[PDB]
Amino acid sequence: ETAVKPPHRTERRNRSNAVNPFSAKYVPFNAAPGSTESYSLDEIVYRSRSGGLLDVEHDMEALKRFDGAYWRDLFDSRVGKSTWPYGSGVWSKKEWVLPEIDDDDIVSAFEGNSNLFWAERFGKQFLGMNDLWVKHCGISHTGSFKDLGMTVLVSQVNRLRKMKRPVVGVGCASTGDTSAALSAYCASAGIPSIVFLPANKISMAQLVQPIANGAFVLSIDTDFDGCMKLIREITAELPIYLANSLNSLRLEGQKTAAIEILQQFDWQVPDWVIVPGGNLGNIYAFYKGFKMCQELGLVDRIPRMVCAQAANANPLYLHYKSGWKDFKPVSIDRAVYALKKCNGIVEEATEEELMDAMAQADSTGMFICPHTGVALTALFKLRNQGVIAPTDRTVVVSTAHGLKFTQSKIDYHSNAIPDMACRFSNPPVDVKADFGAVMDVLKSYLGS
Amino acid sequence: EDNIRRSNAVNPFSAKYVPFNAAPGSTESYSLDEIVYRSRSGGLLDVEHDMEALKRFDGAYWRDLFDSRVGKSTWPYGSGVWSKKEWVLPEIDDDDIVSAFEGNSNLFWAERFGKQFLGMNDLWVKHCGISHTGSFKDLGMTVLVSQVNRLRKMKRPVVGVGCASTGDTSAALSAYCASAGIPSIVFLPANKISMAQLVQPIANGAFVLSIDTDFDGCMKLIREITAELPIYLANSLNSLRLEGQKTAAIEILQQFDWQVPDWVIVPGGNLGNIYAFYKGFKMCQELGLVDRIPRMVCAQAANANPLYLHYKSGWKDFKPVSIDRAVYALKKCNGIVEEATEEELMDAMAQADSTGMFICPHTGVALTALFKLRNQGVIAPTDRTVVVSTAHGLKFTQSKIDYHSNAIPDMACRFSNPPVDVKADFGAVMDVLKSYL
Ligand SMILES: *Cc1c(COP(=O)(O)O)cnc(C)c1O
Ligand SMILES: *Cc1c(COP(=O)(O)O)cnc(C)c1O
Secondary structure, eight states: OOOOSOSOOOOOOSSOTTSOOOOEEEEETTOOSSOOOOBOTTSOOOSBTTTBOEEEEEOHHHHTTSOHHHHHHHHHTTTTOOSTTTTSTTGGGGGGTOTTSOTTTOOOOOOOOOOEEEOHHHIIIIIOOSSEEEEETTSSSSSBTHHHHHHHHHHHHHHHHHTTOSOOEEEEOOSSHHHHHHHHHHHHHTOOEEEEEEGGGOOTTTTHHHHHTTOEEEEEESOHHHHHHHHHHHHTTSOEEEOOTTOHHHHHHHHHHHHHHHHHTTTOOOSEEEEOOSSTHHHHHHHHHHHHHHHTTSOSOOOEEEEEEETTSSSHHHHHTTTTTTOOOOOHHHHHHHHHHTTOEEEEEOHHHHHHHHHHHHHTTOOOOHHHHHHHHHHHHHHHTTSSOTTOOEEEEEOBOGGGGHHHHHHHHTTOOTTOOOTTOOOOEEEOSOHHHHHHHHHHHHOO | OOSOOOTTOOOOOOEEEEETTOOSSOOOOBOTTSOOOSOSSSOOEEEEEOHHHHTTSOHHHHHHHHHHHTTOOSTTTTSTTGGGGGGTOTTOOTTTOOOOOOOOOOEEEOHHHIIIIIOOSOEEEEETTSSSSSBTHHHHHHHHHHHHHHHHHTTOSOOEEEEOOSSHHHHHHHHHHHHHTOOEEEEEEGGGOOTTTTHHHHHTTOEEEEESSOHHHHHHHHHHHHHHSOEEEOOSSOSHHHHHHHHHHHHHHHHTTSOOOSEEEEOOSSTHHHHHHHHHHHHHHHTTSOSOOOEEEEEEETTSSHHHHHHHTTTTTOOOOOHHHHHHHHHHTTOEEEEEOHHHHHHHHHHHHTTTOOBOHHHHHHHHHHHHHHHHTOSOTTOOEEEEEOBBGGGGHHHHHHHTTTOSTTOOOTTOOOOEEEESOHHHHHHHHHHHO
């Protein structure tokens, strides 16, 4: 009869058999015109001879043997898939991510294929826009965009681990989303995850995910400097890979959110993509994904972008208003490089201004993170300057689920935040247990 | 919205309310446009689709048509519920629907947990909670709010929607209402207010009433206000909701490339859910998409309701909360009901979380059930099993925090993983890592 599958399972590559044409390597970020320096992804590598960032470079020549149409159709034939690799919004674009990993080593939770919402009501009643979308990277297994990166990173690591290569585990020194996504993926695969922290930076609340995921969290008696000293001293005496902010392998998974944005728009290029970004790699990552789609010819243009920044966070904005003539190569260089290439813009949000944009977006039905506030603030501003027209297809990237920011909204709505009006707050309304009284609170609210 | 909009439609499809499990041959049917709530017996209602019209198209036609909507960003179609419109609210205009593209939820392979804890290789968790609101309720509210939107749009007296819930239904409800500009009203006793628990409705600009009484007298004012004004009270036991929800069963099949799982595990807090799944699978069977329907399991919290007692006694003592639905369902798919003590559900949670997950206590209740089923040998190690996760784990942190710090009264917390203290000394640190690795 209807053979569903063979009793036992565990689990189509765009390439010549018994000989995979694609490959990638580590190269220095935006290296010289004629440079040879490289590293295998199999090497545990963090900087480049000069102490500079690394960037994963894919063999563009291999990929190009196959035309634009080839790749749109290949990627499109994997939408809706339930198979070991293809499910993931990252692995479905494996060839352009980690072309050489065996599917047996991938560590996926089916990240990607992220909600691309249409802010009909917010666009209209607030910006006069009819084609504003929000890309919910936060609606994932972890609560953030960081799952795109960790899937790749943990895959690469699981690969080195299974090759009898030496990697006993993964280390980290973060109390946020990276630590959460990193501990998650590692746990699914059975790879130890170690978090290193000064004891004065422990918060059961902030570490709920790694703790829940089985991470070995060290609460160390020293400050951050002394904690970094140990990490460095440990990793050098134990093959433990540190997942660092600067890791370029995470960028290979994050770049898929851009490809996906194009995919979801049935390969049409948006006029503007706003990337929030306390973390400067997020925007380069998007740029890399949009650039790659174009290099390979899946589309003809790359979208203009916005690096929306929180007030006084970094000097990125100061640099932009003065056409970067005071710039010199938090990793700004990748942001700058990326904004140059796409003729981008950088814009700001005050602390009060992001909370208000959040209340406005939230009143429209969304339940967003501070960074989307910054993004939307950037948008409300760029709109007044006539830089973003009303009919302009704009996508705002949301990197973390709103459920991670409740305490922020609570404080706001109950007018409990210092230095801020909290003008759009909606606290509950007090009323006597009297019929008529209640009919009044109601009659007005609503109207007549 | 302006895209699919062309006149082509002389809409062959339709639906209406009929009493739940209607006696053989019944003229009793109300229009979905009406605001009804009980049948004539005082009994429940159900949304019956006209299986007649729907059958002029085969299984192949249905599997193909839905699959063509996957990955789509078209007006209603982006949605995991609207992609299945024809079987949800076939008569609503596209301009009426209120959607945030809910659905198309993650179907995760619990590879590690399955193998390491049960000896199962094809255990999947359907994360209905990873969404806009953080719960399964989006599925249901998109439909309710849509239908409410429609009645209203027809310059119809519907000044607002009301609720007397501090949970998920309310969060989902106020979200949909806000996107639509439909006032949402939460009525509550002053002693149940919590900025914490009402964070989402509040954020969503719902009009939250903090009334100076208790629950009973609060229920009274709602009765009073609703007879004077057309505020549609989001029935708990409301039937438009199940129409939205059934699509999660449909999605599960669509997800296995139209293949039927051997077991679906629904953590039955709200009994309508398990019945919603069955409705979804049985609809795919009748219409010829698949050929079987999965056996199911209603996972309960120990002592929740008489459901379990009714089950351990082959439903011999049962008479027709919304228990009947569950019964009717578990009978038709030769289902099972199973219990989870407070402790059991937490430990399971700690075991699933340890494998990469980060789940709500109901999935704790499902896995517990699964664990017992595997022992009794009822569920086989190679059975394609799907556990349904109804709420996002981020809404249950305090639970885990307390569990992982050994502070939950009358429970061991066998799997607490608290952070470990060590001095800032290299041997000291090397020692602890040595044993751990
Ligand atoms: C999120 C992110 C970081 C920072 O991680 P935290 O855990 O929030 O410190 C650094 N680099 C990249 C590329 C990131 O995405
Ligand atoms: C959630 C739900 C309800 C009621 O909401 P609460 O938050 O549980 O009060 C009623 N019926 C069904 C089917 C539900 O899923």
